[PDB]
Amino acid sequence: VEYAEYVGAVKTVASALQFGVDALERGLINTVLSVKLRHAPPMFILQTLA
Amino acid sequence: EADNQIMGPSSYASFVVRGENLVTAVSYGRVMRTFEHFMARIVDSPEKAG
């Protein structure tokens, strides 16, 4: 009954570390999308400028 | 005294939460003592009253 709790305790720390490295491949895509969204002038300017 | 010594046990009659009671400890929080004897009484031939 303590090995059955140590299993849950390694599941908690593993699913916290995997949460923290999932939230960084979710934040890298967010940073890439939000830096694509800052070098993106709209269509009504580039249809005449280009 | 008629006798100087008595014949008693040498170790504690241990009891651990084994594989059948671990499921109900983690799942329900209700362990029983000798789950195997409950299974021997009501699963394996419940028609034989003790």
UniProtKB/Swiss-Prot annotation, chain B:
Stated name of the protein: Major capsid protein
Annotated signal peptide: none
Known role: Self-assembles to form an icosahedral capsid with a T=16 symmetry, about 200 nm in diameter, and consisting of 150 hexons and 12 pentons (total of 162 capsomers). Hexons form the edges and faces of the capsid and are each composed of six MCP molecules. In contrast, one penton is found at each of the 12 vertices. Eleven of the pentons are MCP pentamers, while the last vertex is occupied by the portal complex.
Compartments, record wording: Virion; Host nucleus
Subunit description: Homomultimer. Makes the hexons and eleven out of twelve pentons. Interacts with triplex proteins 1/TRX1 and 2/TRX2; adjacent capsomers are linked together in groups of three by triplexes, heterotrimeric complexes composed of one molecule of TRX1 and two molecules of TRX2. Interacts with scaffold protein; this interaction allows efficient MCP transport to the host nucleus. Interacts with capsid vertex component 2/CVC2. Interacts with the small capsomere-interacting protein/SCP.
Residues included from the entire protein: 297 to 346 of 1381
UniProt similarity note: Belongs to the herpesviridae major capsid protein family.
Highest rank taxon of the organism: Viruses
